[PDB]
Every structure is written in structure tokens, then in C-alpha cells.
Amino acid sequence: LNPESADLRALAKHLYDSYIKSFPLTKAKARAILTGKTTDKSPFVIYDMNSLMMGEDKISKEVAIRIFQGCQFRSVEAVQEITEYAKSIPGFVNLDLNDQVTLLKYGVHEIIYTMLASLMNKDGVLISEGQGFMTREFLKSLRKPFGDFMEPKFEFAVKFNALELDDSDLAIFIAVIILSGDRPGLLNVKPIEDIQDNLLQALELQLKLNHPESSQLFAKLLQKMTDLRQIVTEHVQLLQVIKKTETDMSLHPLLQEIYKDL
Numbered sequence: 001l002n003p004e005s006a007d008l009r010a011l012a013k014h015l016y017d018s019y020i021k022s023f024p025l026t027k028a029k030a031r032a033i034l035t036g037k038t039t040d041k042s043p044f045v046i047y048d049m050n051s052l053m054m055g056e057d058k059i060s061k062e063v064a065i066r067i068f069q070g071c072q073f074r075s076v077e078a079v080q081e082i083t084e085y086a087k088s089i090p091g092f093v094n095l096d097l098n099d100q101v102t103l104l105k106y107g108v109h110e111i112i113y114t115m116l117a118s119l120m121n122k123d124g125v126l127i128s129e130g131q132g133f134m135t136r137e138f139l140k141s142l143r144k145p146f147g148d149f150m151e152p153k154f155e156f157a158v159k160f161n162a163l164e165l166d167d168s169d170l171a172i173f174i175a176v177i178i179l180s181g182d183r184p185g186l187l188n189v190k191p192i193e194d195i196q197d198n199l200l201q202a203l204e205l206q207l208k209l210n211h212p213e214s215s216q217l218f219a220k221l222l223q224k225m226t227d228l229r230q231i232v233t234e235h236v237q238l239l240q241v242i243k244k245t246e247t248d249m250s251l252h253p254l255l256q257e258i259y260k261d262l
């Protein structure tokens with residue numbers, strides 16, 4: 001209702017727009033699939049080995065390793081999407097190239113897991129663009145090293161999902177994440193911090209208007225960044241372990257570039 005906020009709202013609408021355009025599977029779609037809505041169709045459920053083998057009919061000499069390779073390839077694609085989304089954050093392409101690379105390097109994983117929560121409930125996670133649903137227990141039942149990779153994400157998702165954020169909230173939130181001045185090796189932090197200040201102002205107003213009855217959701221939302229960091233650290237530690245165990249296992253280069261010095 002005033003010039004300043006009017007501009008923030010425009011920023012919010014801009015980001016939501018690019019968000020829809022960049023990410024095929026939104027939380028709205030995911031939620032309609034997971035809760036039995038007639039706007040979307042129900043997923044084939046993978047809860048053990050037979051259903052796994054059956055799912056390939058409906059949707060590396062070891063299922064645990066090919067499930068892992070599946071997630072890594074889906075991550076590579078995710079990076080591509082986030083990158084596409086980042087270019088649309090006003091000011092981002094105008095930054096030093098080196099810093100754009102740096103912002104993406106430390107930003108993608110925190111964003112992947114933020115958005116992964118949209119495809120999860122306490123029982124499992126959507127796969128193959130919402131055509132599949134792989135249960136938590138089946139993932140946990142995977143052999144030593146791989147049985148542990150998905151659990152920390154489920155823990156995060158259940159608490160994050162309690163915030164009850166929709167896509168328009170998330171659009172701004174993942175932009176705040178990308179534009180973090182504290183990232184290691186940033187040449188010029190000042191222009192980055194000015195953009196973030198703007199996003200944070202937009203997120204704050206968005207949360208007020210969207211969740212008026214929700215006290216300190218802004219503060220609560222920002223505190224989730226601690227859990228995100230911890231997820232990423234554990235993940236790369238787990239990967240360090242995999243590389244010694246499976247020397248025949250290959251990590252995508254784009255992913256390996258992102259992992260080193262993390």
C-alpha cells in the first residue's frame with residue numbers, strides 16, 4: 001500500500017514467476033501428488049526389491065549403487081535449474097563472474113535440500129518427477145555406506161515442512177541463500193550484501209502477508225540454515241567415504257567441481 005513495499009511485492013512476484021519457469025516439479029504439484037488430489041495422479045510406490053524391479057516397468061550390478069547414481073544425476077540436473085533460476089535474481093548476472101561461480105558452488109546443495117523437502121513426507125520421497133515414490137524404510141535398508149545418505153535429509157524435511165511454506169515463499173528464500181556474502185573466496189562482498197538485503201526485505205514482507213497468523217516465521221525460517229549447512233557437511237563426508245570404498249564408482253565432474261574445498 002506504499003511505494004517501498006509495492007516494490008518489494010514486485011520483487012516477490014518476479015521471483016515466484018522465474019521459480020515456476022525454472023523448476024518443473026513445484027511444491028504445489030508435489031503436495032497434490034502426495035495427498036491424493038485429483039489435479040494429479042498417484043505415484044507407483046517402491047518399498048522393497050520387487051517393487052523396485054516392477055517400477056522400472058512402470059516409470060551397475062547393484063541396486064544401492066544405481067540408486068545413488070540416480071540421485072547424483074538428478075542433482076546435476078538440479079544444479080542446471082538453480083543456475084537458470086539464479087540468472088533471474090536481479091543484480092546477479094551483473095556481479096563479478098568469479099563471484100557468480102562462487103555463489104553457485106556453495107549455494108546449490110543448500111538449495112537442493114530445501115527443495116527436496118517439498119518432495120518428502122515422513123514416509124518417503126517422490127522420484128522420476130512425481131511418477132514414483134520411494135519409501136524412507138527402503139532407503140534405510142540399503143547396504144552399509146549407502147544406507148545412511150538419505151536419513152539426515154528426511155530429518156530436515158519433516159521439521160522444515162512444519163513451517164508450511166508455499167512456492168512463493170520458497171522462491172524468495174532460495175534467492176536469499178544464493179546471495180550470501182559470507183561465502184569463502186568472494187572478491188566483492190558489498191554488492192552481494194546489497195542484493196541480499198533487498199531479498200531479505202522481500203521475504204520478510206512476503207511472510208507477513210502470506211502467513212500473518214504465524215509468529216516469527218521469518219526468524220524461524222532463517223534459523224533453518226544451520227541445519228542445511230550440517231546436512232551438506234555430512235553429505236560430503238559420506239561421499240569422501242564412498243570414494244575409498246567404491247573406487248570403481250564415478251562422480252559427475254560438475255558435482256566434483258562443487259565438492260572440492262567444501
Ligand SMILES: CC(C)(c1cc(Br)c(O)c(Br)c1)c1cc(Br)c(OS(=O)(=O)O)c(Br)c1
Pocket residue numbers: 070071072074075078112116119125126127128129130149150
Ligand atoms: C529424492 C531423490 C532420491 C530423487 C528425486 C528425484 Br525427482 C529422482 O528422480 C530421483 Br532418481 C531421486 C534425490 C536424492 C538425492 Br541424495 C539428491 O541429491 S543429492 O542429495 O545431492 O544426492 C536429489 Br537432487 C534427489
